[PDB]
A paper describes a structure:
The DinG binary complex structure was solved at 2.5 Å resolution by two wavelength anomalous diffraction data based on selenomethionine-substituted protein but the final model was built and refined using data from a crystal of native protein. Although a twelve base oligo-dT substrate was used in the crystallisation, only eleven bases are evident in the structure suggesting these likely comprise the entire ssDNA-binding site. Overall, the DNA is kinked but with many bases stacked upon one another along the strand in a conformation that is quite different to that observed previously in any other SF1 or SF2 protein. The bases spanning the HD1 domain, and crossing over to the HD2 domain, are stacked on one another until they encounter a proline-rich strand (P motif) on the HD2 domain, at which point the next base would clash with this strand if stacked on the preceding one so it is flipped up and over this strand. In all, three bases are contacted by the HD1 domain and seven bases contact the HD2 domain, with an additional base spanning the gap between the domains. Notably, there is an aromatic stacking interaction with Tyr636 intercalated between the first and second bases at the 5’ end of the ssDNA on the HD2 domain. The major protein-DNA interactions at the HD1/FeS domain interface are mediated by two arginine residues, R117 and R211. For DinG, in the binary complex, the HD1 domain has a tighter grip than in the ATP-bound (ternary) state. This is achieved by increasing the number of contacts with the residues towards the 3’-end of the ssDNA binding site. Indeed, consistent with this hypothesis, there is a large hydrophobic pocket on the protein surface in this location, particularly in the binary complex, that could accommodate a variety of bulky lesions such as thymidine dimers.
DinG is another member of the XPD family, that appears to have a poorly defined role in DNA repair. The proteins comprise four domains; the helicase (HD1 and HD2), arch and FeS cluster domains. The FeS domain, that is inserted within the HD1 sequence, contains an iron-sulphur (FeS) cluster at its centre. Here, we present the crystal structures of two complexes of E. coli DinG; a binary complex bound to a ssDNA substrate, and a ternary complex with ssDNA and an ATP analogue (ADP•BeF3), that provide information about how these enzymes translocate on DNA.
Numbering used by the authors: 2 to 373, 378 to 704
Write the structure that this text describes.
DNA sequence: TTTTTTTTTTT
């Protein structure tokens, strides 16, 4: 499988980059990862490879070089998939052009979902049309006019950039802030688009990007897109012709779980309204634009016999679920083991059938309208597209609610009664607990050999959690490799566990935050660190902590206040200037921050990020683990805590020459037996246990 | 055994 010419090509590109790009430094883990990826992707050894490549190993070049070599030899496409658009851009703008220097021949593109692309037609409307005081009837028309004059100028700037190729049309590739509402208007749904009819169709960024996919050697994708391309066999080449690298691979089950997740409203009056609107809309479609294809369900007698039966089912379900909950109150009911009582299951099966039928009708009408008075047709397309979305959520919901198991585990099922607009609304919720069958069918079986890599794949020094969640198995021929970290952590930093007076239990939170803040403040006062990061496991705790350090607002860059890349922008600017700067964030910061040396010398971790015990999904899972005679804490809480802790601690040492401390304020790392195990899955650091000032609680 | 709420993206 590894031909002579291929080894020669990989070696050549390797020597090329190491002695022609300044600072490219070889490493033995890098050589091993190149060889392992090369053997897996050529078919020489087993099926799939899950290789953990800690920061510093040089992971992306390590799979890019053999991946590209094998793709060229075989006239295949290398698909590199990562977690989100920012990481995609990192691969597309930094690593691939670097390889283009030594492979001038290289053909690579990036791929994104339709929703990230501007629609030239709409933007032209927004840039070239007058804001006229929200002309009232015109607002009611929502007829493509800039809300106001500021909006109009911004749109014209965006259009100027688009037309001269300063802007590629992707939402994330422009500096100009775009409101979410604005973006909804600037982009369009597949049906809403004019395709070959539009006078821009040859000029549309999205279609051009897909055209680039077709002749490219490397496509940079995100996991959601790849999954969607495996369900709809529609955007990527045929799986058999694919080399697939799933960078940031630990995210893969969660992404797969989107296919087993739905929440939707089911409250009976609202439902009556929706069905009435739909019936009326189908009749007006038939009158206004007779479709080419008229299904028997569109026949009015049949359509509203169908809708009346659906409604009667919904109303029965409302009554049943309402008996679980106090009247006139917001409430909640979870079904243990995700198991529905027989009558409720029966109802959900019939609902699944009826809502799926309505979804099919709406889809057929929608495609008929899109195939085809442009103004009136577009109003009708929009309404029917809304209807389609409603019934999509419905059929998916009832399909999941009807499942006995998914990948050998229950689907979490539960209802909520929530207040919204002066009223109580009934929601149903389904969340698949395991997703391995999904990954197996869409990826593992479909693509001959896949690389799953990440800086962090293991939990508790083990691939066990990854194996169980992903379905990858040695028995199927998948291999699992953990490369060593290059850095020397014990000499490069320390872990600090202050002598806190309370554990961060539920009752203790107020005192705990107080003690933390005191200690944290003293650290800031030492002026020993310029780059600081504070990491929380809940937004509740983060806000509470923020109340104690309100005198430090100037110094604090808080997740959400600005887009993360801007917050890191400012952080770099101030630290380079000699000022103290503190980032404060949740999971997004714990996962995404990569700050070397001065930029981040002290990491503050409020607590061990254990999963929420009262969450319905966690409860249902623990029930199921119990029924299999496994201990939930051992199998569910502690491994998640280990993975999260590895990731959080992983912010400190990003390079040789990184230095500093990780302050962990959860005393249970020393106080509980499991503490040792969490510490043993971290890199080795010396542990210091300083005394803590008295915690003054605030009103 | 022992634990308590985060986050992107797509058809
Ligand atoms: S093609 Fe669809 S998206 Fe591109 S411009 Fe015409 S309408 Fe807007």
């Amino acid at each position: 499988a590894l031909t002579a010419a291929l080894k020669a090509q990989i070696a050549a590109w390797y020597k090329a980059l190491q002695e022609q790009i300044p600072d490219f430094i070889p490493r033995a883990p890098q050589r091993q990862m190149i060889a392992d990826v090369a053997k897996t992707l050529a078919g020489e050894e087993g099926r799939h490879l899950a290789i953990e490549a800690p920061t510093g190993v040089g992971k992306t070049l390590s799979y890019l070089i053999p991946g590209i070599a094998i793709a060229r030899e075989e006239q295949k496409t290398l698909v590199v998939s990562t977690a989100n658009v920012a990481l995609q851009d990192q691969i597309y703008s930094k690593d691939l052009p670097l390889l283009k220097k030594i492979i001038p021949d290289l053909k690579f593109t990036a791929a994104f979902g339709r929703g990230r692309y501007v629609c030239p037609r709409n933007l032209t409307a927004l840039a070239s049309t007058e804001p006229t005081q929200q002309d009232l009837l015109a607002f009611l028309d929502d007829e493509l006019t800039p809300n106001n004059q500021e909006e109009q100028k911004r749109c014209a700037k965006l259009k100027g950039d688009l037309d001269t190729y300063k802007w590629d049309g992707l939402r994330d590739h422009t500096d100009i802030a775009i409101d979410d509402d604005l973006w909804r208007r600037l982009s369009t749904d597949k049906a809403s688009c004019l395709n070959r009819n539009c006078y821009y169709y040859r000029e549309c960024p999205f279609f051009v990007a897909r055209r680039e996919i077709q002749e490219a050697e490397v496509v940079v994708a995100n996991h959601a897109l790849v999954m969607a391309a495996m369900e709809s066999e529609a955007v990527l080449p045929d799986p058999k012709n694919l080399l697939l690298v799933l960078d940031e691979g630990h995210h893969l089950p969660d992404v797969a779980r989107d296919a087993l997740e739905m929440s939707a409203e089911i409250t009976a009056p609202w439902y009556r309204l929706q069905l009435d609107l739909f019936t009326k809309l189908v009749a007006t479609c038939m009158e206004q634009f007779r479709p080419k294809t008229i299904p028997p369900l569109a026949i009015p007698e049949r359509l509203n016999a169908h809708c009346e039966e659906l409604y009667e089912l919904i109303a029965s379900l409302n009554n049943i679920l309402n008996l679980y909950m106090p009247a006139g109150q917001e409430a909640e009911h979870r079904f243990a083991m995700g198991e529905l009582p027989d009558e409720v299951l029966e109802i959900c099966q019939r609902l699944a059938k009826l809502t799926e039928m309505l979804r099919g009708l709406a889809e057929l009408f929608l495609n008929d309208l899109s195939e085809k008075d442009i103004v009136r047709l577009h109003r009708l397309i929009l309404q029917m597209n809304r209807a389609l979305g409603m019934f999509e959520a419905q059929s998916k919901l009832w399909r999941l609610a009807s499942l006995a198991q998914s990948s050998g585990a229950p689907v979490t099922k539960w209802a909520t009664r929530e207040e919204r607009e002066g009223q109580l609304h009934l929601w149903f919720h389904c969340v698949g607990i395991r997703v391995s069958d999904q990954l197996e069918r869409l990826l593992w079986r479909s693509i001959p050999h896949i690389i799953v890599t990440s800086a962090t794949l293991r939990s508790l020094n083990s691939f066990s959690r990854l194996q169980e969640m992903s379905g990858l198995k040695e028995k199927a021929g998948d291999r699992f490799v953990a490369l060593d970290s290059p850095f020397n952590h014990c000499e490069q930093g320390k872990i600090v566990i202050p002598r806190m007076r309370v554990e961060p239990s539920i009752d203790n939170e107020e005192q705990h935050i107080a003690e933390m803040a005191a200690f944290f403040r003293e650290q800031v006062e030492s002026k020993k660190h310029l780059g600081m990061l504070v990491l929380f496991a809940s937004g509740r705790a983060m806000q509470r902590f923020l109340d104690y350090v309100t005198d430090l607002r100037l110094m604090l860059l808080v997740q959400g206040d600005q887009p993360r890349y801007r917050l890191v922008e400012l952080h770099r600017k101030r630290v380079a200037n000699g000022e103290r700067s503190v980032l404060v964030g949740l999971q997004s910061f714990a996962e995404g921050l990569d700050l070397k040396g001065d930029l981040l010398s002290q990491v503050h971790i409020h607590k061990i990020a254990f999963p929420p015990i009262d969450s319905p999904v966690v409860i249902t899972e623990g029930e199921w683990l119990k029924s299999l005679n496994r201990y939930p804490f051992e199998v569910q809480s502690l491994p998640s805590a280990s993975f999260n802790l590895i990731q959080q601690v992983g912010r400190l040492i990003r390079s040789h020459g990184c230095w500093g401390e990780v302050v962990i304020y959860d005393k249970r790392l020393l106080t509980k037996n499991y503490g040792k195990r969490l510490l043993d899955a971290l890199p080795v650091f010396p542990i210091e246990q300083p005394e803590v000032p008295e915690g003054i609680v605030k009103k």
